């Protein structure tokens, strides 16, 4: 590459893997969204919540792909595994699953940052800090807050709490 | 002081103490607000309610400090004791604590007024009447109304009532 | 905590201490501001300068508290020590004291950053860099410039220089 | 009087005297203002400062006269003594004289209030509190601040300080 400078093969590879991870997260949120659109689930607020996340994760991937090209690495795509569930249970079930997924993306970002740091690659480190690390922290806090609120409500009386959360928070 | 007229050392001292009392009330409301921002508490309406009060109490203090200087007394600051709790329980717990605090500020205002009256200091008396006495009466009424409403709701079914109060009143 | 990830107990504690440090700086600037509002000091520009800083430091604290909750740590408040002086001397005296205070906040930020770095916590490091490290550098430069200008003026003829600085710079 | 209720002859008399006091203060400020308009004094800022006060004191008198009629008392006018000086010296001299005058008006208001209070006349007390007591406190604070600033400047170098105060504060 005529442009590549201070960009390790290890970061390049890891960025490719994180692209797969983001695209898979998107795919998972697509599935979550359409499950909550089912006539026998019918929680529009929850549907919209996850469809909006599908988009955000797809955008992350694209931002990572743009950066890959800017640095002179080569995007390599792998198969996207289907989501881990076909049916997603109740709102709390879905929100827990979303938290688990986000923590795994966050840890992958944290790992990539540690790698860029070991490879003395400050452009990578700033890139992750500016567009990914804070976004994740804020999203996981928000999911945390929702889980707490769902749990307060579905303890009381389950169907009622689930409706009211969708109506008044989402 | 070239400006000081009809301003007793006793009022001056008492104003300094009431400044500490207001700043401490502010600090207490800061703590209440951020507790309700915790991901495992997650009641934004309650958070905003108390953060707005923190500001109001800080403003009271500042108004008292401005008045001190206008009269020719000297502001003297003391340590601010931390709030009396680190964790604030449920919305009713927090609202009761807020009522207790406000009644204590109100009584301190009532005491200062009695003092200004004994010292024949009508400027002080009008100052407290115009900016503090009615504000307190209205705030304690509002807290009263909220407590009643929280108690009606958390009697029925606790987590549900607490969510609904935050959503529909706050 | 359901949200806490890569957030050490050491950072959590240190953030709590830095909150106390910021709130205490705010309290110090409150005192500085109202001293310069005294009828026998009467430098409105200096008063406004420090009252504006009181607000900025309170905001820092609040930003740190928000971040604490976002990361899943627990805000813990301690007593706020009164400011180190009751009377603040002349403008240069006050500005030197302000520089001393700011350097101590800056060093506390630098220490916290080093800690986050030792604990491989890049979210913390980016947080301090984005909202605190540059703000401090710029504020200390500005105070530096003011001190130089006050010193040039109060060397010449003290009361005159102090009036002219308040009027024409502040 | 068909309207008079709870309005003592003592308050009525005292209000008449306070009207004379306000009109005399106005007359004094008229004199101060035109002295500073002299080609051999020539301080326009000081001139405007006192001419504006002449108006304010005339307005006080008129407000007191309006109140007298509203309560059913009878306005009685006496001679207005000329001001106590024909020439008013330097800005500090004039400002000290203004402070002395204002303190005497303030004490007369304080006395009238004490009287209304002894005569259980709360309308009088509220009237003085709403339009006079705070206005005086704020005006005497402002004069206090000016005196301090003039004294800082005319200590340094007298003619220079006096010009700069008129130019940059007034």
XYZ file of C-alpha atoms in Angstrom:
680
model
C 0.000 0.000 0.000
C 1.138 3.465 -0.996
C -0.621 4.950 2.044
C -0.076 2.436 4.863
C 1.982 3.744 7.777
C 2.173 2.484 11.379
C -0.698 0.047 10.717
C 0.033 -3.486 11.938
C -1.279 -6.676 10.305
C -2.632 -7.589 13.737
C -4.849 -4.473 13.985
C -5.912 -4.910 10.414
C -7.072 -8.494 11.182
C -8.727 -7.535 14.452
C -10.637 -4.691 12.700
C -11.917 -7.208 10.178
C -13.148 -9.431 13.031
C -14.780 -6.519 14.804
C -16.600 -5.652 11.546
C -18.052 -9.232 11.583
C -18.973 -8.774 15.216
C -20.835 -5.487 14.545
C -22.641 -6.904 11.452
C -23.676 -9.908 13.496
C -24.962 -7.647 16.282
C -26.971 -5.780 13.632
C -28.410 -9.106 12.409
C -29.320 -10.068 15.973
C -31.163 -6.747 16.479
C -32.986 -7.224 13.158
C -34.275 -10.511 14.508
C -35.201 -9.000 17.883
C -37.082 -6.169 16.204
C -39.163 -8.340 13.908
C -40.025 -10.784 16.749
C -41.563 -7.910 18.714
C -43.508 -6.970 15.530
C -45.273 -10.446 15.637
C -49.050 -10.200 16.078
C -48.732 -12.520 19.100
C -46.008 -10.363 20.744
C -47.083 -6.909 19.535
C -44.807 -4.472 21.409
C -44.085 -1.655 18.989
C -41.886 0.327 21.359
C -39.638 -2.728 21.819
C -39.661 -3.420 18.060
C -38.546 0.198 17.324
C -35.899 0.063 20.127
C -34.156 -2.919 18.558
C -34.594 -1.890 14.879
C -32.886 1.378 15.746
C -30.007 -0.567 17.309
C -29.672 -2.749 14.153
C -29.020 0.399 12.198
C -26.519 1.723 14.771
C -24.522 -1.493 14.690
C -24.510 -1.580 10.878
C -23.167 1.986 10.991
C -20.404 1.010 13.406
C -19.302 -1.706 10.965
C -19.294 0.757 8.105
C -17.296 3.267 10.102
C -14.749 0.512 10.832
C -14.613 -0.364 7.135
C -14.046 3.244 6.164
C -11.181 3.437 8.700
C -9.658 0.163 7.429
C -9.439 1.720 3.885
C -8.148 5.063 5.269
C -5.274 3.214 6.941
C -4.485 1.071 3.964
C -5.701 -2.258 5.224
C -7.931 -4.630 3.337
C -11.490 -5.388 4.321
C -12.142 -9.136 4.431
C -15.628 -10.415 5.060
C -16.687 -13.701 6.625
C -20.009 -15.494 6.973
C -22.449 -13.924 9.402
C -23.757 -16.417 11.875
C -27.504 -16.284 12.406
C -28.657 -14.920 15.749
C -28.436 -17.226 18.711
C -32.249 -17.369 19.164
C -35.270 -17.537 16.792
C -37.719 -16.393 19.506
C -36.744 -13.837 22.106
C -39.170 -14.349 25.043
C -40.418 -11.322 27.013
C -39.071 -7.737 27.090
C -36.726 -8.509 30.030
C -35.441 -11.614 28.321
C -34.692 -9.538 25.197
C -33.086 -6.684 27.118
C -30.797 -9.060 29.065
C -29.757 -10.625 25.767
C -29.059 -7.135 24.418
C -26.898 -6.286 27.465
C -24.889 -9.542 27.040
C -24.302 -8.679 23.372
C -23.261 -5.116 24.089
C -20.833 -6.153 26.810
C -19.231 -8.519 24.334
C -18.865 -5.721 21.725
C -17.508 -3.434 24.424
C -14.927 -6.074 25.454
C -13.912 -6.538 21.820
C -13.375 -2.744 21.556
C -11.383 -2.782 24.801
C -9.257 -5.618 23.436
C -8.620 -3.818 20.154
C -7.635 -0.698 21.994
C -5.156 -2.621 24.166
C -3.724 -4.083 20.928
C -3.386 -0.662 19.264
C -1.726 0.555 22.412
C 0.754 -2.378 22.424
C 1.467 -1.628 18.731
C 1.878 2.107 19.500
C -0.965 3.011 17.106
C -2.530 6.236 18.537
C -4.711 6.894 15.516
C -6.515 3.582 16.197
C -6.827 4.386 19.878
C -8.306 7.816 19.218
C -10.679 6.380 16.566
C -12.118 3.857 19.055
C -12.357 6.439 21.798
C -14.094 9.077 19.691
C -16.781 6.855 17.988
C -17.190 3.575 19.951
C -16.055 3.500 23.622
C -18.392 6.248 24.913
C -21.325 5.182 22.697
C -21.114 1.743 24.289
C -20.843 3.043 27.793
C -23.965 5.209 27.285
C -25.932 2.411 25.570
C -25.167 -0.135 28.297
C -26.168 2.426 30.999
C -29.514 3.016 29.174
C -30.132 -0.742 28.860
C -29.239 -1.064 32.554
C -31.828 1.578 33.420
C -34.493 -0.152 31.268
C -33.821 -3.569 32.756
C -34.225 -2.093 36.248
C -37.536 -0.506 35.252
C -38.875 -3.605 33.467
C -37.903 -5.719 36.526
C -39.720 -3.328 38.910
C -42.872 -3.622 36.772
C -42.976 -7.274 35.774
C -42.370 -8.270 39.372
C -45.623 -6.500 40.318
C -47.888 -8.053 37.552
C -46.224 -9.264 34.346
C -48.431 -8.472 31.345
C -49.474 -5.134 32.808
C -45.846 -4.106 33.547
C -44.695 -5.077 30.072
C -47.443 -3.022 28.367
C -46.842 -0.008 30.577
C -43.054 -0.055 29.949
C -43.573 -0.202 26.181
C -46.187 2.589 26.320
C -44.587 4.972 28.779
C -40.825 4.480 28.418
C -40.339 3.216 24.904
C -18.447 49.386 57.567
C -19.254 52.614 55.772
C -22.674 51.246 54.785
C -23.880 49.247 57.805
C -27.008 50.621 59.467
C -29.521 48.866 61.748
C -27.818 45.504 61.097
C -27.128 43.539 64.286
C -24.171 41.181 64.800
C -26.745 38.552 65.753
C -28.546 38.709 62.374
C -25.250 38.797 60.587
C -24.186 35.554 62.358
C -27.545 33.875 61.860
C -27.465 34.729 58.109
C -24.065 33.079 57.885
C -25.486 29.938 59.531
C -28.501 29.920 57.251
C -26.136 30.133 54.245
C -24.445 26.910 55.540
C -27.857 25.356 55.993
C -28.934 26.168 52.401
C -25.590 24.970 50.911
C -25.919 21.762 52.879
C -29.487 21.289 51.626
C -28.148 21.769 48.088
C -25.484 19.106 48.757
C -28.137 16.731 50.090
C -30.256 17.204 46.932
C -27.175 16.630 44.750
C -26.767 13.285 46.464
C -30.472 12.440 46.151
C -30.447 13.285 42.456
C -27.434 11.181 41.555
C -28.728 8.183 43.587
C -31.889 8.151 41.466
C -29.627 8.292 38.357
C -28.057 4.879 39.400
C -28.655 2.108 36.853
C -30.139 -0.005 39.672
C -32.562 2.770 40.772
C -33.233 4.431 37.404
C -36.005 6.969 38.109
C -35.264 9.955 35.906
C -38.246 12.008 37.033
C -37.091 11.686 40.660
C -33.478 12.445 39.669
C -34.587 15.666 37.858
C -36.895 16.644 40.791
C -34.021 16.637 43.267
C -31.334 18.097 40.935
C -33.652 21.036 40.351
C -33.985 21.493 44.119
C -30.157 21.432 44.538
C -29.985 24.417 42.254
C -32.814 26.233 44.077
C -31.114 25.802 47.433
C -27.752 26.966 46.063
C -29.568 30.055 44.759
C -31.123 30.736 48.156
C -27.637 30.693 49.701
C -26.356 33.081 47.073
C -29.278 35.421 47.590
C -28.497 35.413 51.331
C -24.844 36.160 50.587
C -25.758 39.046 48.324
C -27.989 40.464 51.095
C -25.236 40.026 53.719
C -22.910 42.243 51.550
C -25.725 44.756 50.831
C -26.201 45.233 54.575
C -22.537 45.473 55.344
C -22.028 42.186 57.101
C -19.276 39.723 56.381
C -19.848 36.339 54.820
C -18.119 33.581 56.790
C -18.125 30.051 55.475
C -17.900 26.809 57.425
C -17.404 23.181 56.441
C -20.351 21.557 54.709
C -21.312 18.318 56.330
C -21.933 15.474 53.909
C -25.543 14.383 53.523
C -26.983 12.227 56.245
C -27.402 9.193 53.924
C -25.329 7.622 51.093
C -28.315 5.646 49.733
C -31.810 7.070 49.754
C -34.176 4.049 49.540
C -37.410 4.319 47.522
C -39.204 7.433 46.196
C -41.326 7.763 49.378
C -38.282 7.390 51.569
C -36.562 10.174 49.588
C -39.597 12.456 49.592
C -40.069 12.099 53.378
C -36.402 12.972 53.831
C -36.925 16.003 51.589
C -39.941 17.135 53.662
C -37.922 16.798 56.922
C -35.137 18.908 55.393
C -37.486 21.580 54.114
C -39.285 21.883 57.438
C -35.926 22.429 59.088
C -35.021 25.200 56.585
C -38.461 26.713 57.072
C -37.996 26.703 60.877
C -34.579 28.324 60.491
C -36.200 31.075 58.356
C -38.956 31.489 60.949
C -36.322 31.786 63.669
C -34.334 34.373 61.727
C -37.443 36.383 61.113
C -38.329 36.366 64.825
C -34.755 37.570 65.501
C -34.979 40.394 62.940
C -38.276 41.347 64.479
C -36.783 41.410 68.018
C -33.919 43.554 66.637
C -36.413 45.850 64.842
C -34.844 45.058 61.445
C -37.712 45.385 58.884
C -35.460 45.133 55.855
C -34.471 41.607 56.984
C -38.078 40.692 57.649
C -39.225 41.868 54.230
C -36.270 40.103 52.533
C -37.233 36.745 54.091
C -40.896 37.247 53.328
C -40.401 38.216 49.690
C -37.894 35.449 48.637
C -38.002 32.562 51.172
C -41.133 32.188 53.369
C -43.665 31.707 50.534
C -41.285 29.613 48.389
C -40.976 27.204 51.306
C -44.659 27.071 51.985
C -45.358 26.234 48.310
C -42.539 23.655 48.102
C -43.644 21.829 51.257
C -47.279 21.770 49.976
C -46.063 20.241 46.651
C -43.959 17.635 48.491
C -46.995 16.929 50.689
C -49.112 16.332 47.590
C -46.455 14.018 46.071
C -46.054 11.995 49.246
C -49.830 11.474 49.353
C -49.825 10.305 45.732
C -46.781 8.030 46.114
C -48.382 6.509 49.260
C -51.677 5.850 47.415
C -49.750 4.033 44.662
C -47.090 2.086 46.525
C -49.718 0.795 48.919
C -51.492 -0.838 45.953
C -48.377 -2.557 44.361
C -44.950 -1.042 45.048
C -42.781 -1.240 41.923
C -45.721 -0.471 39.657
C -46.779 2.579 41.741
C -43.247 3.944 41.827
C -42.841 3.695 38.025
C -46.231 5.242 37.357
C -45.567 8.198 39.716
C -42.227 8.923 38.040
C -43.784 8.628 34.557
C -47.056 10.452 35.058
C -46.406 13.038 37.781
C -42.714 13.753 37.588
C -23.663 -3.861 38.982
C -25.361 -5.123 35.849
C -23.504 -2.529 33.760
C -20.000 -2.334 35.262
C -17.213 -3.440 32.928
C -13.478 -2.644 33.052
C -14.066 -0.157 35.897
C -11.656 -0.625 38.809
C -12.491 0.069 42.468
C -9.421 2.308 42.493
C -10.744 4.603 39.724
C -14.146 4.597 41.304
C -12.625 5.812 44.620
C -10.366 8.355 42.951
C -13.351 9.781 40.986
C -15.201 10.213 44.261
C -12.219 12.130 45.686
C -11.932 14.289 42.597
C -15.652 15.139 42.937
C -14.876 16.427 46.496
C -11.938 18.353 45.110
C -14.063 20.052 42.404
C -16.914 20.863 44.864
C -14.376 22.338 47.242
C -12.871 24.431 44.435
C -16.397 25.667 43.671
C -16.848 26.593 47.355
C -13.527 28.443 47.337
C -14.581 30.460 44.253
C -17.939 31.252 45.888
C -16.013 32.765 48.767
C -13.641 34.656 46.458
C -16.548 36.074 44.481
C -18.508 37.350 47.456
C -15.371 38.902 49.050
C -14.874 41.024 45.929
C -18.581 42.018 46.193
C -17.855 43.629 49.670
C -18.508 47.382 49.752
C -14.939 47.859 51.037
C -13.404 45.781 48.189
C -15.868 46.580 45.389
C -14.327 45.007 42.262
C -17.232 43.719 40.208
C -15.115 42.346 37.377
C -13.157 40.224 39.878
C -16.381 39.160 41.634
C -17.896 37.998 38.282
C -14.605 36.249 37.282
C -14.654 34.039 40.365
C -18.451 33.451 40.511
C -18.238 32.163 36.955
C -15.455 29.784 38.008
C -17.570 28.500 40.960
C -20.171 27.422 38.464
C -17.585 25.796 36.163
C -16.135 23.756 39.005
C -19.588 22.662 40.197
C -20.251 21.520 36.621
C -17.023 19.525 36.518
C -18.118 17.691 39.678
C -21.499 16.952 38.172
C -19.941 15.682 34.972
C -17.752 13.359 37.075
C -20.821 12.154 38.968
C -22.689 11.451 35.759
C -19.689 9.429 34.499
C -19.431 7.505 37.799
C -23.099 6.341 37.328
C -22.545 5.602 33.599
C -19.693 3.262 34.529
C -21.539 1.595 37.337
C -19.662 3.010 40.274
C -21.224 4.538 43.338
C -21.011 8.204 44.190
C -19.909 8.740 47.793
C -19.838 12.219 49.234
C -17.655 13.572 52.022
C -17.639 16.797 54.014
C -16.543 19.875 52.103
C -13.844 21.749 53.903
C -14.372 25.495 54.063
C -12.043 27.590 51.929
C -8.558 28.143 53.229
C -9.089 31.922 53.682
C -11.988 34.141 54.888
C -10.500 37.293 53.300
C -8.671 37.176 50.001
C -6.456 40.316 49.917
C -5.926 42.167 46.616
C -6.627 41.012 43.031
C -3.091 39.572 42.632
C -3.348 37.757 45.926
C -6.658 36.221 44.778
C -5.378 35.317 41.319
C -2.262 33.598 42.738
C -4.517 31.618 45.062
C -6.659 30.678 42.060
C -3.580 29.496 40.112
C -2.429 27.346 43.090
C -5.898 25.773 43.271
C -6.087 25.092 39.557
C -2.647 23.501 39.463
C -3.754 21.189 42.243
C -6.917 20.189 40.303
C -4.814 19.726 37.186
C -2.378 17.459 39.088
C -5.290 15.442 40.468
C -6.578 14.974 36.880
C -3.085 13.982 35.736
C -2.893 11.467 38.576
C -6.290 9.985 37.748
C -5.328 9.661 34.135
C -2.099 7.838 35.035
C -4.230 5.502 37.198
C -6.732 4.817 34.395
C -3.805 4.155 32.127
C -2.234 1.687 34.617
C -5.658 -0.017 34.897
C -6.017 -0.074 31.079
C -9.224 2.003 31.252
C -9.331 4.010 27.959
C -12.863 5.267 28.471
C -11.673 7.083 31.629
C -8.642 8.450 29.830
C -10.701 9.791 26.940
C -13.291 11.269 29.355
C -10.601 13.271 31.194
C -8.964 14.360 27.972
C -12.165 15.513 26.286
C -13.722 17.536 29.208
C -11.010 18.379 31.797
C -7.337 18.327 30.666
C -7.624 21.020 27.955
C -10.076 23.171 29.959
C -7.491 23.310 32.735
C -4.626 24.083 30.447
C -6.577 27.001 28.907
C -7.780 28.312 32.294
C -4.293 28.269 33.826
C -2.885 30.075 30.726
C -5.605 32.784 31.092
C -4.877 33.168 34.823
C -1.169 33.347 33.947
C -1.876 36.159 31.491
C -3.992 38.049 34.075
C -1.391 37.716 36.806
C 1.234 39.140 34.435
C -1.031 42.083 33.608
C -2.041 42.762 37.228
C 1.667 42.629 38.229
C 2.627 45.121 35.478
C -0.052 47.529 36.751
C 0.150 47.229 40.521
C 3.906 47.635 40.347
C 3.374 51.077 38.774
C 0.744 52.416 41.321
C -1.375 49.874 43.209
C -4.938 51.166 43.591
C -4.915 52.686 40.118
C -3.620 49.450 38.500
C -6.193 47.332 40.300
C -9.106 49.549 39.168
C -7.873 49.695 35.592
C -7.449 45.885 35.374
C -10.982 45.311 36.673
C -12.405 47.945 34.290
C -10.488 47.184 31.124
C -9.688 43.460 31.253
C -12.377 41.959 33.419
C -62.546 61.561 56.339
C -64.974 59.109 54.796
C -62.101 56.750 53.948
C -59.706 56.957 56.913
C -59.299 53.714 58.850
C -56.477 52.609 61.177
C -54.430 55.693 60.218
C -53.008 57.537 63.232
C -52.433 61.305 63.415
C -48.851 60.469 64.370
C -48.156 58.547 61.128
C -49.916 61.199 59.144
C -47.603 63.879 60.645
C -44.480 61.768 60.262
C -45.336 61.094 56.571
C -45.611 64.832 56.033
C -42.147 65.303 57.574
C -40.671 62.513 55.494
C -42.099 64.195 52.362
C -40.126 67.366 53.351
C -37.066 65.229 53.926
C -37.305 63.590 50.464
C -37.969 66.947 48.695
C -34.986 68.422 50.484
C -32.819 65.468 49.435
C -33.975 66.086 45.853
C -32.987 69.766 46.191
C -29.578 68.767 47.545
C -28.993 66.433 44.562
C -30.080 69.193 42.158
C -27.352 71.352 43.638
C -24.775 68.545 43.511
C -25.594 67.832 39.880
C -25.297 71.404 38.664
C -22.013 71.947 40.590
C -20.449 69.052 38.677
C -21.764 70.670 35.444
C -19.572 73.811 36.178
C -16.925 74.452 33.513
C -14.296 74.460 36.289
C -15.466 71.082 37.704
C -16.638 69.392 34.492
C -17.436 65.796 35.524
C -20.437 64.767 33.461
C -20.702 61.267 34.897
C -20.927 62.735 38.417
C -23.410 65.394 37.245
C -25.681 62.683 35.706
C -25.315 60.453 38.833
C -26.695 63.150 41.116
C -29.349 64.548 38.710
C -30.748 61.037 38.452
C -30.900 60.843 42.254
C -32.753 64.215 42.425
C -35.469 62.688 40.318
C -35.592 59.497 42.423
C -35.999 61.466 45.632
C -38.715 63.675 44.123
C -40.509 60.462 43.126
C -40.253 59.070 46.649
C -41.927 62.234 47.964
C -44.688 61.931 45.408
C -45.244 58.289 46.249
C -45.551 59.287 49.926
C -48.038 62.008 48.998
C -50.126 59.593 46.974
C -50.183 57.197 49.962
C -51.127 60.016 52.375
C -54.253 60.741 50.199
C -55.037 56.999 49.813
C -55.136 56.670 53.602
C -57.159 59.782 54.149
C -54.531 62.003 55.669
C -53.788 65.542 54.629
C -50.603 66.595 52.908
C -49.039 69.626 54.594
C -46.006 71.261 53.073
C -43.271 73.231 54.806
C -40.398 75.376 53.576
C -37.554 73.490 51.941
C -34.236 74.405 53.422
C -31.512 75.075 50.879
C -28.771 72.466 50.658
C -26.129 72.524 53.332
C -23.340 73.470 50.864
C -23.073 75.800 47.817
C -19.897 74.086 46.534
C -19.383 70.362 46.863
C -15.589 69.800 46.619
C -14.248 66.700 44.830
C -16.075 63.491 43.810
C -15.236 61.765 47.135
C -16.390 64.767 49.101
C -19.700 64.701 47.186
C -20.159 60.947 47.521
C -19.538 61.039 51.300
C -22.117 63.811 51.570
C -24.526 61.665 49.553
C -23.957 58.673 51.878
C -24.607 60.862 54.976
C -27.858 62.090 53.404
C -29.024 58.625 52.439
C -28.320 57.204 55.883
C -30.437 59.975 57.346
C -33.340 59.168 54.961
C -32.921 55.487 55.756
C -33.068 56.217 59.517
C -36.186 58.331 59.012
C -37.802 55.383 57.153
C -36.730 53.017 59.936
C -38.249 55.377 62.497
C -41.522 55.645 60.591
C -41.721 51.909 60.298
C -41.189 51.468 64.051
C -44.003 54.015 64.569
C -46.389 52.202 62.202
C -45.535 49.011 64.002
C -46.264 50.570 67.436
C -49.580 51.863 66.007
C -50.358 48.416 64.516
C -50.526 49.875 60.984
C -49.428 47.017 58.636
C -50.396 48.831 55.459
C -47.815 51.532 56.310
C -45.206 48.926 57.146
C -45.720 47.060 53.884
C -45.704 50.345 51.900
C -42.283 51.312 53.312
C -40.902 47.834 52.815
C -42.063 47.471 49.217
C -40.941 50.922 47.842
C -38.336 52.477 50.201
C -36.403 50.145 52.566
C -34.779 47.955 49.874
C -34.198 50.868 47.460
C -32.207 52.580 50.201
C -30.238 49.521 51.104
C -29.238 49.021 47.438
C -28.418 52.718 46.896
C -26.220 52.939 50.000
C -24.378 49.719 48.951
C -23.730 51.246 45.469
C -22.487 54.513 47.012
C -20.314 52.428 49.352
C -18.802 50.632 46.364
C -18.157 53.948 44.543
C -16.541 55.568 47.559
C -14.201 52.574 47.874
C -13.265 52.851 44.196
C -12.808 56.642 44.247
C -10.627 56.282 47.391
C -8.447 53.606 45.723
C -7.892 55.938 42.749
C -7.498 59.361 44.319
C -5.018 57.936 46.793
C -2.778 56.961 43.853
C -2.878 60.370 41.966
C -5.888 62.638 42.523
C -6.864 64.344 39.260
C -6.107 61.230 37.236
C -8.177 58.978 39.563
C -11.123 61.359 39.506
C -11.187 61.510 35.678
C -10.846 57.757 35.321
C -13.690 57.064 37.806
C -16.021 59.446 35.967
C -15.058 57.952 32.579
C -14.992 54.262 33.396
C -17.501 53.770 36.223
C -19.969 56.589 35.838
